[PDB]
Amino acid sequence: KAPGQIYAYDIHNTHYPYVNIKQDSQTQLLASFRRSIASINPFSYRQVPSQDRAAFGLRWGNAWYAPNPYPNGIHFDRVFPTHYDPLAETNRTKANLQLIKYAPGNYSTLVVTSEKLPRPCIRTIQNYRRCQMVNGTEKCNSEAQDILAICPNWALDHMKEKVRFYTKALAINNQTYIRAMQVEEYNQGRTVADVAPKTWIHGTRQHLRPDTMWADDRYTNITQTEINEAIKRVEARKAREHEKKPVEQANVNANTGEQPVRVEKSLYP
Amino acid sequence: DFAELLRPLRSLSFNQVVDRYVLIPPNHTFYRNWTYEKFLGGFGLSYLILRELPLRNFYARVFVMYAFAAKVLDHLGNPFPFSGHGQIVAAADRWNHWDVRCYDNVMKALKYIRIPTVQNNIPEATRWYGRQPGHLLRADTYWIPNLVSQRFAKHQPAHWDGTQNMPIFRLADPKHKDSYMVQFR
Amino acid sequence: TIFAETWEASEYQYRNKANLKTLPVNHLGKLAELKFDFVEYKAHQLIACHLYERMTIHCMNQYGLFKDFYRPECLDAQYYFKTCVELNAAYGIQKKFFPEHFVGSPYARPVPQFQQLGL
Amino acid sequence: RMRYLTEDPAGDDPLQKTKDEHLVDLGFIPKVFGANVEVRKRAPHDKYL
Amino acid sequence: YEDFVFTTPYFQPESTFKSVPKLFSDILLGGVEWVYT
């Protein structure tokens, strides 16, 4: 009847790995000393949990460690506008009562959840489907009325909205299907037979050279003489391609008192 | 180093891995929180030995106790009582909150930070679940009518009818005829 | 998915809900906290969540995964990278199936057709 | 012009507006229209600001 | 579909290539109220 150990215990083989994140000499030397006497030291604390004993987290000197919260620009001012920028400092400064309040969830992520419908409302749904697959839809009126009556109205609204969402997602997935299965001009008339016997590695750096000059030793033996000659050839080809240029279009955002179009920004200011 | 993390898994089969690290035999008899009791209780035991220092000057021990209090306040935070709570970062394991996994409201309070909408209201489902009245004991010595009446009351057996919601006591609702004297604030 | 290095912050803020999180650009300041020498090209620092990924690699090469990687400059990079891809995965899904939640979308507050005004 | 084009989010309560479930039972089946995505808001002449 | 019926109206695949030019709209966390003292 031995206590169960987690996988992390087999990585370290001990419950007393004195992990301190503070990289000061005083701290790491004391941890190495404490890490060696943890077997016969009464002032020993575990950092690897087990079935029989809980554990502590990572240590920061005498205090405890937690990562810097992911940058979040949301803040709330009290006395004056601080213009808080989470990217201007490495570690987030503490929140003073008279200066700022930060957003909730220092350590939080964005997820999607769903409420659990009432148990009696679930049983009416199970009985309807069961009577449906057995006796058919046309003979489930009594089971349908029990749903509308026993299920509270807030649940019927959820059920009503679930159908509209999945109807929306159904369309959003089929539009992507249409754009994906569209045959572009560069693949007209091409089938699986016109595909090459190549795999993912054949498009990597070893087989397919990147579009950079110093990716390999291709242009390492080039001299200034060969360059001047190449500059003359590219200019020759430009004697036939520069003949065309797109015409200037009108500025749709000429009026400043008009909602401007979120047009693609220029590469450079 | 990424391969060194999987060393104990290469010598084992999948069934051995599951039986080893996943299917740990349930045993909820251990005093898991002894780790926290020993650590934090050591401050008090350490104060017993530290308050007996042979330091002659009274103001030199003032400095020592000021340093010892600094060590504690890194965990306790607020020195005043009835003001706040201490802060201890603990390890995350499968046995966190193991005896309250059955309760749903405890999960929502710990995990979910809900985003307020324009119609600034608590979710209707959350409000509806909150009205299903909880069970409140009849025993009451705080209301003097019951302090007298309940001395002559006969406790009769409540025969189980097969449910988990038998209202054999009063209900924790302000509008209940046996709880209207209770102040819900 | 974002097919650029830059994105408008307002496009990832909610219009009918309280804004408690933003989708910030990469924190280039964390890159200067690495004490060791490393090579980083400026052409890879703006794309979302990739800077924190390369930093984690640089730290996992200089150090390992045991007793030396556990320093604040390296753990914050690993935590940022793991958190950046989780938030961006949720925002990307929310942008795909809930575009009406965000500012700039014409469906957050639909403008009616002229046939609905009765003129 | 900027404050003329400064609106607040979410408008007014839709529940204080005529329902489509009610118009059906009254004898008029409403027609569902799409969102007008081609209009750009602009400010009027200065005299109306 | 797989022993399940999901009633939906006739889908119009032409809605996929709907030209929707993006428009500018900025949100200002921190702005103006209705009344001031």
Binding site: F80, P81, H83, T256, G257, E258, Q259, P260 | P116, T117, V118, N120 | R15, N16, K17, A18, N19, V103 | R1, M2, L5, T6, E7, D8, P9, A10, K41 | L23, F24, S25, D26, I27, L28, L29, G30, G31, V32, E33
Partner: peptide
């Protein structure tokens, strides 16, 4: 939802000055 929330349709530039917030 934040009380001091406004949606603007035209571009604006805010001053990056200490103790002040304005266009």
């Amino acid at each position: 939802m934040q009380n001091t929330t406004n949606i603007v349709h035209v571009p604006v530039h805010m001053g990056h000055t200490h103790y002040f917030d304005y266009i």
